[PDB]
């Protein structure tokens, strides 16, 4: 669980919502979560998220206590500048596997190495050696590469490595706006890598960490599995 990471509250109307860990409590009891409220401002009560309209809740009244942008309302819910900032038990949230969406990032390092990929050494006296991954650990990978013309296994920390690739090999986009798309890399630039997708020849330029070596042919189906490229759709009646 990390501060400013995103977790999902287990219960309430806020159940499953992506929420940012505003504050990790030292006691490890609760965490302050940044949410967008799902409230009717007690007008309907004798819903989709919307930014907290402090003026509206004041208009509706009820349990409202304004203190600047910080406002306390109905059940000591805390809000500030349109968002919620309320503590929730750590036991009450889902701390792992959450991952915000890009949209959630708008609302509110990493290492990925797999045995079999070709990597390059970015620094050190061992710089510009390329080789294939034997094994992997989470930080100092102790990536045990088998470098070209080297029968020995060395150890490299993740931070010392990058995912290299000569032009013409198949690549997959691991994470990004393009993730799931595949292609052959035509040209490699400093940290820049350009490639043509398999589905369409429309160009793609991505960072060196966002590609991996996988020999599989392109899927041809969107995330969600409902639609696929080249299909007929109804846009409006």
């Amino acid at each position: 669980l990390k501060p400013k990471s995103w977790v999902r509250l287990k219960r309430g109307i806020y159940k499953d919502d992506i929420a940012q860990v505003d504050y990790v409590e030292p006691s490890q009891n609760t965490i302050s979560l940044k949410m967008i409220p799902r409230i009717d401002y007690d007008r309907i009560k004798a819903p989709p998220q919307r930014l907290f309209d402090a003026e509206k809740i004041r208009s509706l009244g009820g349990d409202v206590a304004s203190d600047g942008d910080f406002l306390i309302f109905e059940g000591n819910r805390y809000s500030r500048k349109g968002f919620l900032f309320k503590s929730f038990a750590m036991s009450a949230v889902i701390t792992e596997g959450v991952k915000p969406t890009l949209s959630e990032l708008e609302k509110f390092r990493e290492h990925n190495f797999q045995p079999g990929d070709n990597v390059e050494v970015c620094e050190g006296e061992l710089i510009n050696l390329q080789g294939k991954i034997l094994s992997v650990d989470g930080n100092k990978i102790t990536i045990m590469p088998k470098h070209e013309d080297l029968k020995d296994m060395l150890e490299f920390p993740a931070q010392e490595l990058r995912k290299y690739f000569k032009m013409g090999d198949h690549v997959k986009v691991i994470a990004g706006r393009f993730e799931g798309d595949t292609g052959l890399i035509v040209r490699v630039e400093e940290n820049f890598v350009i490639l043509f997708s398999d589905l369409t020849m429309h160009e793609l330029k991505v960072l060196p960490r966002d590609l991996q070596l996988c020999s599989e042919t392109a899927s041809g189906v969107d995330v969600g599995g409902q639609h696929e490229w080249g299909e007929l759709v109804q846009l409006d009646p």
């Binding site: 032009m167 013409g168 052959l184 035509v186």
Partner: protein, 171 residues
């Protein structure tokens, strides 16, 4: 690259073809079914050179078609990464190079063109040239490319080439 190999086929004959011209129909059926086709295993079947042997026909159970195994010699075209071949430029665009290698198409990415070859839209026929105007690549020119990768989408193969190495380009 062009090859001369031995291939096989199963000719499914509709029952109407039977009668007198039976063996002849198999050969004519074969020529029509394999010539022009392409596969990932062998590539483009350019033409059937000779028919070595015709297998005894076996009635397929539950269907009218009877299958005659056929051994034939054919000419195939199967490209490989790193091989240099001559192509004809067919179209100049600001997006890259549209080329053709025999019956197979090949795309040369603009990113794989030396920086000296600026694209020039204002020229009468679109073309690719060096600012020095020394070398100009346009429609109908013969160029040397290196195949960087191949793909097979719906029995048809296409490739991607590059002009980054020395002694490539205009011929």
């Amino acid at each position: 690259m062009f090859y001369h190999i031995s291939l096989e086929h199963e000719i499914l004959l509709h029952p109407r073809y039977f009668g007198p011209n039976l063996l002849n129909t198999v050969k004519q059926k074969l020529f029509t079914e394999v010539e022009g086709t392409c596969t990932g295993k062998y590539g483009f079947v350019i033409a059937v050179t000779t028919i070595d042997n015709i297998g005894a026909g076996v009635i397929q159970p539950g269907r009218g078609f009877v299958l005659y195994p056929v051994k034939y010699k054919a000419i195939v075209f199967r490209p490989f990464k790193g091989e240099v071949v001559d192509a004809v430029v067919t179209q100049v665009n600001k997006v890259g190079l549209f080329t053709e290698i025999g019956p197979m198409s090949c795309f040369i990415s603009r990113h794989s063109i030396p920086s000296e070859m600026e694209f020039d839209p204002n020229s009468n026929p679109p073309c690719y040239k060096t600012m020095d105007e020394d070398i100009v690549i346009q429609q109908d020119d013969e160029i040397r490319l290196k195949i960087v990768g191949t793909r097979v989408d719906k029995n048809d193969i296409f490739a991607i080439g590059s002009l980054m190495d020395d002694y490539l380009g205009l011929v």
